[PDB]
Amino acid sequence: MRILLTNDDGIHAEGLAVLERIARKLSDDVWVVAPETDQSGLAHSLTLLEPLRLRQIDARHFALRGTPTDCVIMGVRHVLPGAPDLVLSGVNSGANMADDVTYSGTVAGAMEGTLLGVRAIALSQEYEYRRIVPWETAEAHAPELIGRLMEAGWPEGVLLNLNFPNCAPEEVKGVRVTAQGKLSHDARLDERRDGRGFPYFWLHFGRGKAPVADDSDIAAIRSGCISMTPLHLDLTAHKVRAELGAA
Amino acid sequence: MRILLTNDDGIHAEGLAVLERIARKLSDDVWVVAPETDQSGLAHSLTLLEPLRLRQIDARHFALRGTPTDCVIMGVRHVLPGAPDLVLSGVNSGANMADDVTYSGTVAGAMEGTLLGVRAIALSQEYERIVPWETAEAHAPELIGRLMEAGWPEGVLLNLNFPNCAPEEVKGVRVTAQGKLSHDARLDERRDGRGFPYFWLHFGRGKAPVADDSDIAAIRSGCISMTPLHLDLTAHKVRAELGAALG
Amino acid sequence: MRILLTNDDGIHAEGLAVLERIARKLSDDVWVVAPETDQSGLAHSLTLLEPLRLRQIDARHFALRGTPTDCVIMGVRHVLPGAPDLVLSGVNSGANMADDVTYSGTVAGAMEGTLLGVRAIALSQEYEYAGDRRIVPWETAEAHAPELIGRLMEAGWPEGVLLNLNFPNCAPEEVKGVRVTAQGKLSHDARLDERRDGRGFPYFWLHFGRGKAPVADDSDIAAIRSGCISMTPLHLDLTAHKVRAELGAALG
Amino acid sequence: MRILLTNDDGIHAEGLAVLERIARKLSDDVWVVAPETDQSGLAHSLTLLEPLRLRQIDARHFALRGTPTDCVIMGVRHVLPGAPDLVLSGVNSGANMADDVTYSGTVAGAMEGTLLGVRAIALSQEYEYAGDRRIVPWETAEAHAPELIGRLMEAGWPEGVLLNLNFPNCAPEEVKGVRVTAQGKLSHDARLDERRDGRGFPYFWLHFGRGKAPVADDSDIAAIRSGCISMTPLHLDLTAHKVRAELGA
Numbered sequence A: 001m002r003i004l005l006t007n008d009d010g011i012h013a014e015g016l017a018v019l020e021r022i023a024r025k026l027s028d029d030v031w032v033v034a035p036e037t038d039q040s041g042l043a044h045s046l047t048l049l050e051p052l053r054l055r056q057i058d059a060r061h062f063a064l065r066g067t068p069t070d071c072v073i074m075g076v077r078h079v080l081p082g083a084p085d086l087v088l089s090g091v092n093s094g095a096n097m098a099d100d101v102t103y104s105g106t107v108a109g110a111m112e113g114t115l116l117g118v119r120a121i122a123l124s125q126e127y128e129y130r131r132i133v134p135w136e137t138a139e140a141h142a143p144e145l146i147g148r149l150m151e152a153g154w155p156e157g158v159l160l161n162l163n164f165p166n167c168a169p170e171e172v173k174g175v176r177v178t179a180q181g182k183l184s185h186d187a188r189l190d191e192r193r194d195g196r197g198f199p200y201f202w203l204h205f206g207r208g209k210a211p212v213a214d215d216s217d218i219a220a221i222r223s224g225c226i227s228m229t230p231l232h233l234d235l236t237a238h239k240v241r242a243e244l245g246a247a
Numbered sequence B: 001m002r003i004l005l006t007n008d009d010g011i012h013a014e015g016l017a018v019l020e021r022i023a024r025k026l027s028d029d030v031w032v033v034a035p036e037t038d039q040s041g042l043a044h045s046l047t048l049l050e051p052l053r054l055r056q057i058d059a060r061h062f063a064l065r066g067t068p069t070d071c072v073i074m075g076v077r078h079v080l081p082g083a084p085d086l087v088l089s090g091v092n093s094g095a096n097m098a099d100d101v102t103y104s105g106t107v108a109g110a111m112e113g114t115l116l117g118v119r120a121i122a123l124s125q126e127y128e129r130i131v132p133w134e135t136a137e138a139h140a141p142e143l144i145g146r147l148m149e150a151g152w153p154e155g156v157l158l159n160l161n162f163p164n165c166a167p168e169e170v171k172g173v174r175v176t177a178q179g180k181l182s183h184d185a186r187l188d189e190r191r192d193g194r195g196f197p198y199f200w201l202h203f204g205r206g207k208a209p210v211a212d213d214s215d216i217a218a219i220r221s222g223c224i225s226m227t228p229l230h231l232d233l234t235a236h237k238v239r240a241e242l243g244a245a246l247g
Numbered sequence C: 001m002r003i004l005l006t007n008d009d010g011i012h013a014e015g016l017a018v019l020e021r022i023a024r025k026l027s028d029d030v031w032v033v034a035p036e037t038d039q040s041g042l043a044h045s046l047t048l049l050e051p052l053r054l055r056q057i058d059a060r061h062f063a064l065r066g067t068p069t070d071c072v073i074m075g076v077r078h079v080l081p082g083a084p085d086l087v088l089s090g091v092n093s094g095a096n097m098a099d100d101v102t103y104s105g106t107v108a109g110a111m112e113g114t115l116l117g118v119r120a121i122a123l124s125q126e127y128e129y130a131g132d133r134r135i136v137p138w139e140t141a142e143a144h145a146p147e148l149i150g151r152l153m154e155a156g157w158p159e160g161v162l163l164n165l166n167f168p169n170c171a172p173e174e175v176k177g178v179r180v181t182a183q184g185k186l187s188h189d190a191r192l193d194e195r196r197d198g199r200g201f202p203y204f205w206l207h208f209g210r211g212k213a214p215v216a217d218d219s220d221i222a223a224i225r226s227g228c229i230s231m232t233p234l235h236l237d238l239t240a241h242k243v244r245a246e247l248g249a250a251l252g
Numbered sequence D: 001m002r003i004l005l006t007n008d009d010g011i012h013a014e015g016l017a018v019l020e021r022i023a024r025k026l027s028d029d030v031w032v033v034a035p036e037t038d039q040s041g042l043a044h045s046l047t048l049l050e051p052l053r054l055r056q057i058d059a060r061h062f063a064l065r066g067t068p069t070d071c072v073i074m075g076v077r078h079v080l081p082g083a084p085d086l087v088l089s090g091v092n093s094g095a096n097m098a099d100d101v102t103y104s105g106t107v108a109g110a111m112e113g114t115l116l117g118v119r120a121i122a123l124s125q126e127y128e129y130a131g132d133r134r135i136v137p138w139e140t141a142e143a144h145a146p147e148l149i150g151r152l153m154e155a156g157w158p159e160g161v162l163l164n165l166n167f168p169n170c171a172p173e174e175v176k177g178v179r180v181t182a183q184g185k186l187s188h189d190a191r192l193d194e195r196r197d198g199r200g201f202p203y204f205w206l207h208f209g210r211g212k213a214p215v216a217d218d219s220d221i222a223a224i225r226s227g228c229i230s231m232t233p234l235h236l237d238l239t240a241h242k243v244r245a246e247l248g249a
């Protein structure tokens, strides 16, 4: 019933307005703590070296000069009158799938909710080009999905990662419980000079359309299905522990 | 044989000098690409929104105004004459165990090595700061040698923690699971020199029960801990509870 | 007739909305390039080491992640179709008087206009606290600025000089008049407050003890304390010309 | 006798090692508070919105994550055991003349010293490029600055005025002399170079050149172009006094 919202696109981004409309279908007790600005690539980082600055827009909406992870902690530990029952992060402008999950500020917001002991869901909306994001699709489908998930709980320590395909609402083919996909890791550095002549680089990622696993988040979205992947924060490769020849 | 080093403590930090002495026990072909400044809590974030600035100290040592993840990408894709055979990240001033792994720049350095297709190890030294660097320094070379000698699986990185003991006092080594600690985030509220509010975020140690197979338990016992980690975050066991759809 | 606006309070600050209303009393050809956020203390600094990021709000309003000086240069050299005839900077939330001038982003916005060859005016509005909130009587700058600027533009003033305008904290109909003032001099009371962060590491806040000491009767400060609008002509030649001849053996 | 040094080039920059050598010709009581990194274009800005972080290198050398202005305040009010008698700011890598003075971190260091009630001098060294390596003839400032500052300190100068010193790009023994100059007026040569980042998003670099135009024969610029050291007394009253009477009206 007490729902806390954050995102990585910023307090003023349309995706967050969309999330709050989704949230209000589930409860009236909604709280928003979101970054001041875009947080692309910020992953699960938080702000320890500099002060956090909190800006109140109204008694339920706050912007924070910090990461999504900072936002969730601020919400849970300072802003709300008690722990939220659900944390929602998004709706991101652009999908978060496969190896994105490690780098995603939207996914990290949910993670943080989960580390704080709260049920948490990340939501991301695939689009096409500039951006025409079919927000109505997440908006039409997210409420009932979250309602069902909340009704059937899910395990402690696991968060849900939802991606909505670039389709019109009535065109989405269905929903699938997926696994995290894998794409080729295509990091690229572009070297330039700044006009006082000093070198610098831009980092970006080539995002190829290669084959992925048929049960992946990617494959689902390519098929026009909503993807729901349960994710956890234990990174141990348990199957590997036994070797250990010789410890 | 080609070894790339990075850390989160910065190019000038003693932990990185320690790592390079360790690395030189394994090969003379060592390359260093490390942040300009000491930077906690950066996790697996990278720098997309601003330029990266690379600074050459000598032919094998480079500082980068960016994250450990940026450092590994720069090293692999731009600075080295070909892919390294091994990426080492650390030796961090402070342990990285249990829920730290999600937030650790030191660990993310290794994660990035792995995502680039390279065997990778993160190394961290528990302290009280008085950091008993000599302990990691005494024990790391042989451990890494054995690990390299035995393969380990593709997609898995190793997370090594050394206890706060004198070198001759360490009790042994254990292949461990990632522990789970209680989330212990603290916000201190203040007012700046102009009266305006701000917050400091920091973390205490939390109060969880330690599993006897965890990284934490090993370190508490005076043992070196080695946890194999992987980058598939799917909670596979949970997928089947999909009511009511496929996967 | 072509007017460019900027400020140091940010694209979304009320003082900039105020300045645009004033500007529209003087022309319909108004352009706005302003910082994304608050710029206190940024003086005449500009951004050389990092990229500038421009954001278009509409055809005449742009936010820039940079300083008020960066804004003017962006406006003059990139955004507008030709040089503005007038650069206005403000209306700042708080006065910019005396030793402030060297540090003020608002004043710098005008300085940059002037160095770019354009008539330029900085506007600032004095306020009072209740007791933490600022109550800024924007209506005062709003009521009085249009005619003052119109008269100044009509009479013209020398090239290389910018005007620095302060409005007192009075209701519009209470302002006692306007004075051409000199820059005042306040006691310089910079203070360092030492603290420890959440992890125990030291840091400092820099702040300034303000205080009501006596100033020169022809100063900007004195005028504002009297309830008068202050107009100080400023220039960008810092040479202490009177002191050059004073010599310990060399030409010039 | 107590001398505080700062710069805009940063605690590790050669120009600050040069300045300390110059300073030690004048006193053995020298204190250094300088920025952690390069501070081009920071003018007289200071740090109000974020914390200042101070780092001790030696008992006499400190780096501050902040502006030259912040450094001088820190040095005067906190680090030194009492006010310095002299603040020196530089030796900058590159001249600071004419309309540079308004933008210059090095000059602002000296400005702040003056506002804090201390005699202050900014020092800058003109250079040239060999391709892209700047070759800065530091030896020129080094050779000439100690005596000039000695004389200046021996003769007083007025309260509220700072001195801006520029050394020409000449070999030490080739400098033609010294001149008390006026601040020049250059052409403002700014432009904006538009690019796209790794993700396709626009950004600009702000390029500021020098003007390339004729200047007054008594300016800092004309002196330096002639191979002379330039010394310009500057003050912090920006009032255009000659214009006030005109303006009422």
Ligand SMILES: [Mg+2]
Pocket (backbone or CB within 6 Å): A008, A009, A039, A040, A092, A093, A106
């Ligand atoms: Mg986003």
Ligand SMILES: [Mg+2]
Pocket (backbone or CB within 6 Å): B008, B009, B039, B040, B092, B093, B094, B106
């Ligand atoms: Mg560290």
Ligand SMILES: [Mg+2]
Pocket (backbone or CB within 6 Å): C008, C009, C039, C040, C092, C093, C106
């Ligand atoms: Mg302001």
Ligand SMILES: [Mg+2]
Pocket (backbone or CB within 6 Å): D008, D009, D039, D040, D092, D093, D106
């Ligand atoms: Mg410099």
